[PDB]
Structures are given as C-alpha cells and as structure tokens.
Amino acid sequence: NPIAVTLLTGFLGAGKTTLLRHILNEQHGYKIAVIENEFGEVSVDDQLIGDRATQIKTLTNGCICCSRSNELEDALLDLLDNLDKGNIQFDRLVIECTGMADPGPIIQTFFSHEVLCQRYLLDGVIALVDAVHADEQMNQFTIAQSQVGYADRILLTKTDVAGEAEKLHERLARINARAPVYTVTHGDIDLGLLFNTNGFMLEENVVSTKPRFHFIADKQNDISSIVVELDYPVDISEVSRVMENLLLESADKLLRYKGMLWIDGEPNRLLFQGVQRLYSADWDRPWGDEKPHSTMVFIGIQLPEEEIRAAFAGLRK
The missing domain is CATH 3.30.1220.10 (CobW-like, C-terminal domain)
Structure with a gap:
C-alpha cells in the first residue's frame, strides 16, 4: 500500500477552491491529506509541526491539511513520519499545483526520491480548465498549455457560461490527445472524479x-x-x-x-x-x-x- 497521489493543476481561478472546501470540511469519510498553497477557513481539530517545519493540520472531518509554504519533499516526508509514528492516518493525497505551477517537477520528485518512490504512488494529473478563460490563458502563458499537456483527465468547468466552447474543447484535444475531457455540465466535481485514473500505469x-x-x-x-x-x-x-x-x-x-x-x-x-x-x-x-x-x-x-x-x-x- 503505497499511498495514491493526485495532482490537481490548472490555471488560476478554474474551480478548485469549491472542490477543496468540499474535501476539507464535509464528512465524506475519505482519509485524505491535502497539500495546498495556503490555508483557509476549515475546522481544525489539532495541528502538528514535523521535523521539517511542516505544519500538518488534522481537520474535524478526519482529513489532513498542509500548506505549500514548505518544500514538497519535506512535507511528503513529514507526512510519512507522522503516519508511521501514528499521529495521523490518511489513504490519499491531493497536491494542489494551480496558477503558474509546473506539474513536471512535482511528478519527478515522486519518482527521484528513494523513499517517496516506495511509499507513494501517483495516480493522476487532473487539470481543471475554466471554459470562459482557458483560450486566452493558454494564448498568453505556455504553462497553461503545459498543465493541460501533463493531464490524465481534463475537467472542463463553467460550460454553462461560456458561449461557444466547442472550439476550446477541440483545442484541448489537439494539445492533449491522451486525456478525456469531462465537462461538468450540472453539479460540482465529485472528489471521485479525481481518483483512479490509472494515468501512470x-x-x-x-x-x-x-x-x-x-x-x-x-x-x-x-x-x-x-x-x-x-x-x-x-x-x-x-x-x-x-x-x-x-x-x-x-x-x-x-x-x-x-x-x-x-x-x-x-x-x-x-x-x-x-x-x-x-x-x-x-x-x-x-x-x-x-x-x-x-x-x-x-x-x-x-x-x-x-x-x-x-x-x-x-x-x-
């Protein structure tokens, strides 16, 4: 049982915040650890500071919350230390890498590190793409297209407000011919939609x-x-x-x-x-x-x- 890792990426303001606030606060019953950029308004039970400065917070819903104020490697090793000592339990890890962030280096730390190679297992890269802005975002920043190219599952959101995203749809295909694009036509993204993508098999x-x-x-x-x-x-x-x-x-x-x-x-x-x-x-x-x-x-x-x-x-x- 290496722990399954999801990297949630995509350009700023795509719709993650609604997804994390779900994952962090609701009693969904999954034993999930989230490394996100910065904390925000979620019920904390307790908090822990690891040998490597990782503030690891235990939420009332049983999920674990970290900041990205750390270097990644260290938060991932602190999480494991506290796991094995028994201060925390968690089945899953979602790492936020939205904005300008590059999925490349994060993926490589998972493979290049001796320890995390064994204890963790990347399942997938999920890109959230804002149908309203993705086209211009992509046109301005390479890394908007990189993030799509590194995806195993593209989640296209805000379809309900974008006037003619048949076009975006079809460009996401050209950039990334491997990933299915699922369009979030009605409800929210189910934390489910993030898991089991088998993208690294x-x-x-x-x-x-x-x-x-x-x-x-x-x-x-x-x-x-x-x-x-x-x-x-x-x-x-x-x-x-x-x-x-x-x-x-x-x-x-x-x-x-x-x-x-x-x-x-x-x-x-x-x-x-x-x-x-x-x-x-x-x-x-x-x-x-x-x-x-x-x-x-x-x-x-x-x-x-x-x-x-x-x-x-x-x-x-």
Missing part, C-alpha cells in the same frame, strides 16, 4: 481523441500531441535505438508520452510510458485475435515532428 488505449485533418489549427499551439500509427511490427533493438535518440534530442521538450508497440517476432504487445526524462516499458497482453498495430503519442513543446515520424517510418522491413 501502462496503457494499451493510448489515444483518447484520434487526430483529424485540419492542418492550420494545430500550429495554433506551442504544446501539442504527435500521434504515430504503425501497421508494421518493428525490430526490438532498432526501436530501442530510435526511442533513446528521440528521447535524447527532445528531452526538455517532452512532457508525456505513451505507446503500444507491435514488435517483430513477439505475439505480445509492448507498452511504454514516460514523463520528460524518465520512462519505462513492459510486455503486456497478447495480440490474440486483434490486428496487431502500433499507436504512440508524444506530448511536448516545439517537437520536431517531421523527424520523429521519419525515425519510425524507416523501421520498415
């Missing part, structure tokens, strides 16, 4: 919104999704060389990437996933009766698409 269903034809529309974005579709099996070492090079050349440009590969002389599909510089792979379920094939998505800034498709194109036998 290997996936055979790699693309959510298969790309269309319009060619000018894509150049609208600095972050985009490049989806590669192969109807041939490849040699395992050849494609290993191609990926390592591809990863080497666009390392500080890639945000996320995932694939399903048809490998030469193997009846079992090959899956891969990565975030910036860190990647993995594993053999996954049998091709059984299905047409074998390959689907990859690479999400990033200013990616050299011509060259990527070229590299995979010449894997032909």
Whole structure:
C-alpha cells in the first residue's frame, strides 16, 4: 500500500477552491491529506509541526491539511513520519499545483526520491480548465498549455457560461490527445472524479481523441500531441535505438508520452510510458485475435515532428 497521489493543476481561478472546501470540511469519510498553497477557513481539530517545519493540520472531518509554504519533499516526508509514528492516518493525497505551477517537477520528485518512490504512488494529473478563460490563458502563458499537456483527465468547468466552447474543447484535444475531457455540465466535481485514473500505469488505449485533418489549427499551439500509427511490427533493438535518440534530442521538450508497440517476432504487445526524462516499458497482453498495430503519442513543446515520424517510418522491413 503505497499511498495514491493526485495532482490537481490548472490555471488560476478554474474551480478548485469549491472542490477543496468540499474535501476539507464535509464528512465524506475519505482519509485524505491535502497539500495546498495556503490555508483557509476549515475546522481544525489539532495541528502538528514535523521535523521539517511542516505544519500538518488534522481537520474535524478526519482529513489532513498542509500548506505549500514548505518544500514538497519535506512535507511528503513529514507526512510519512507522522503516519508511521501514528499521529495521523490518511489513504490519499491531493497536491494542489494551480496558477503558474509546473506539474513536471512535482511528478519527478515522486519518482527521484528513494523513499517517496516506495511509499507513494501517483495516480493522476487532473487539470481543471475554466471554459470562459482557458483560450486566452493558454494564448498568453505556455504553462497553461503545459498543465493541460501533463493531464490524465481534463475537467472542463463553467460550460454553462461560456458561449461557444466547442472550439476550446477541440483545442484541448489537439494539445492533449491522451486525456478525456469531462465537462461538468450540472453539479460540482465529485472528489471521485479525481481518483483512479490509472494515468501512470501502462496503457494499451493510448489515444483518447484520434487526430483529424485540419492542418492550420494545430500550429495554433506551442504544446501539442504527435500521434504515430504503425501497421508494421518493428525490430526490438532498432526501436530501442530510435526511442533513446528521440528521447535524447527532445528531452526538455517532452512532457508525456505513451505507446503500444507491435514488435517483430513477439505475439505480445509492448507498452511504454514516460514523463520528460524518465520512462519505462513492459510486455503486456497478447495480440490474440486483434490486428496487431502500433499507436504512440508524444506530448511536448516545439517537437520536431517531421523527424520523429521519419525515425519510425524507416523501421520498415
């Protein structure tokens, strides 16, 4: 039981505040620890100060509240210390990273740290997108599109006030072809909608919104999704060389990437996933009766698409 971690991101004033105020105050019964930027008007039972300056507050609803006045690593290690000593219990962790915040470095701290690698397990990146402002936000700040690109589940809110967000909808798809966009048509976001996204597990269903034809529309974005579709099996070492090079050349440009590969002389599909510089792979379920094939998505800034498709194109036998 590593603890499941959710990172809630997206641009300032999208609709998190209603969600946290729910998660913090209501007797929803979940044993959740929230690391948010700053405290605010929630019933505290008690508070704790960890070896690392982490003010860890115990709320009456049984949830745990931290500030982001800390460095992350230390709050995550203080939370664990108090967990293991028995001063707190919690099943889940939601880390707020809204505003200009970059999901990249937070995700990497989860993997690069020896301890938190074992004790925590990232489940997903949830982006909240304000339908009313997202288009301009994205047009002004790269990091508004980055946050969408790093998402496993996009939650689009304020649809009820935005006049024509068919357009936004369809641009969110171009930026991020992996994440489903769920539109919050009526009630609030159920804390449920944040969990179990399996976004950091290997996936055979790699693309959510298969790309269309319009060619000018894509150049609208600095972050985009490049989806590669192969109807041939490849040699395992050849494609290993191609990926390592591809990863080497666009390392500080890639945000996320995932694939399903048809490998030469193997009846079992090959899956891969990565975030910036860190990647993995594993053999996954049998091709059984299905047409074998390959689907990859690479999400990033200013990616050299011509060259990527070229590299995979010449894997032909």
